[PDB]
Design a protein around this motif. Structure first.
Motif, PDB file in Angstrom:
ATOM      1  N   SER B   3      45.393  30.339  40.744  1.00 33.34           N
ATOM      2  CA  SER B   3      45.777  31.185  41.866  1.00 33.34           C
ATOM      3  C   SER B   3      47.289  31.219  42.041  1.00 33.34           C
ATOM      4  N   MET B   5      51.242  32.378  41.327  1.00 29.10           N
ATOM      5  CA  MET B   5      52.230  33.354  40.878  1.00 29.10           C
ATOM      6  C   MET B   5      53.521  32.669  40.442  1.00 29.10           C
ATOM      7  N   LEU B  16      44.504  34.531  39.535  1.00 27.18           N
ATOM      8  CA  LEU B  16      43.885  34.841  40.819  1.00 27.18           C
ATOM      9  C   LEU B  16      42.406  34.475  40.820  1.00 27.18           C
ATOM     10  N   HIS B  48      27.386  27.256  56.189  1.00 34.79           N
ATOM     11  CA  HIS B  48      26.850  27.918  57.373  1.00 34.79           C
ATOM     12  C   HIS B  48      26.433  29.348  57.061  1.00 34.79           C
ATOM     13  N   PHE B  50      25.724  32.927  55.849  1.00 37.22           N
ATOM     14  CA  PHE B  50      26.593  33.800  55.069  1.00 37.22           C
ATOM     15  C   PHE B  50      28.026  33.755  55.583  1.00 37.22           C
ATOM     16  N   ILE B  51      28.980  33.965  54.682  1.00 43.31           N
ATOM     17  CA  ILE B  51      30.332  34.349  55.074  1.00 43.31           C
ATOM     18  C   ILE B  51      30.848  35.498  54.214  1.00 43.31           C
ATOM     19  N   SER B  52      32.164  35.681  54.210  1.00 36.69           N
ATOM     20  CA  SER B  52      32.811  36.569  53.252  1.00 36.69           C
ATOM     21  C   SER B  52      34.286  36.227  53.092  1.00 36.69           C
ATOM     22  N   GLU B  54      37.309  38.207  52.256  1.00 34.68           N
ATOM     23  CA  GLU B  54      37.986  39.480  52.045  1.00 34.68           C
ATOM     24  C   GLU B  54      39.501  39.312  52.089  1.00 34.68           C
ATOM     25  N   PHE B  55      40.155  39.604  50.970  1.00 36.98           N
ATOM     26  CA  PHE B  55      41.545  39.207  50.768  1.00 36.98           C
ATOM     27  C   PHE B  55      42.487  40.386  50.968  1.00 36.98           C
ATOM     28  N   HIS B  56      43.748  40.086  51.260  1.00 37.36           N
ATOM     29  CA  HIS B  56      44.815  41.073  51.152  1.00 37.36           C
ATOM     30  C   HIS B  56      46.002  40.518  50.372  1.00 37.36           C
ATOM     31  N   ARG B  57      45.787  40.255  49.089  1.00 42.78           N
ATOM     32  CA  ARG B  57      46.682  39.392  48.324  1.00 42.78           C
ATOM     33  C   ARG B  57      47.965  40.121  47.951  1.00 42.78           C
ATOM     34  N   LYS B  58      48.830  40.327  48.939  1.00 38.27           N
ATOM     35  CA  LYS B  58      50.006  41.171  48.762  1.00 38.27           C
ATOM     36  C   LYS B  58      51.224  40.345  48.367  1.00 38.27           C
ATOM     37  N   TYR B  59      51.493  40.285  47.066  1.00 39.71           N
ATOM     38  CA  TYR B  59      52.704  39.647  46.566  1.00 39.71           C
ATOM     39  C   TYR B  59      53.541  40.622  45.747  1.00 39.71           C
TER      40      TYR B  59
END
Lengths: 89, 89
Positions: B3, B5, B16, B48, B50-52, B54-59
């Motif tokens: 993960s 950079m 990633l 616990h 379900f989860i999720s 959801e990414f905003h991997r802004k580099y």
């Protein structure tokens, strides 16, 4: 465990990770017998610039546990505890 | 690091996490000199229900690296590698 769901002897309790984000992005939602803690950490700098951890933490209430007796609580350490005793209690 | 950079000697490479979700929910986006890998794992059973994730991997892209030379690649192990050599190369 700070992210564990477990029905105790006769009590339903949950710990949840909210260490790095806030009530404003922490959307504790329920849907009947459902607990969807739509958490979210936006603007999350890490090993690669920014990211975000947007959650849909949908876990259900045991049939032997009263949704109304379940109450959430967010600590200063960022641990959200969602816990309600059984219907038996 | 899967993960991480880092601009190498003269080459920009990134690993990633895409271990548990798919190109369909993995929205590799860029915005000029920006790399927003809006990843997402929905329906994610864990400690616990379900989860999720959801990414905003802004580099962002180093000023010495050509966006056009940067190419992503998703492995069977679920590692997305976004890597383009410098403008110098």
């Amino acid at each position: 465990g700070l992210s564990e769901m477990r029905l105790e002897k006769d009590r339903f309790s949950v710990n949840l990770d909210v260490k790095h984000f806030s009530p404003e992005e922490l959307k504790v939602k329920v849907l009947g017998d459902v607990i969807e803690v739509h958490g979210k950490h936006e603007e999350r700098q890490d090993e690669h610039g920014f990211i975000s951890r947007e959650f849909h933490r949908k876990y259900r209430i045991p049939a032997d546990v009263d949704p109304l007796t379940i109450t959430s609580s967010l600590s200063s350490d960022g641990v959200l505890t969602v816990d309600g005793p059984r219907k038996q209690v």
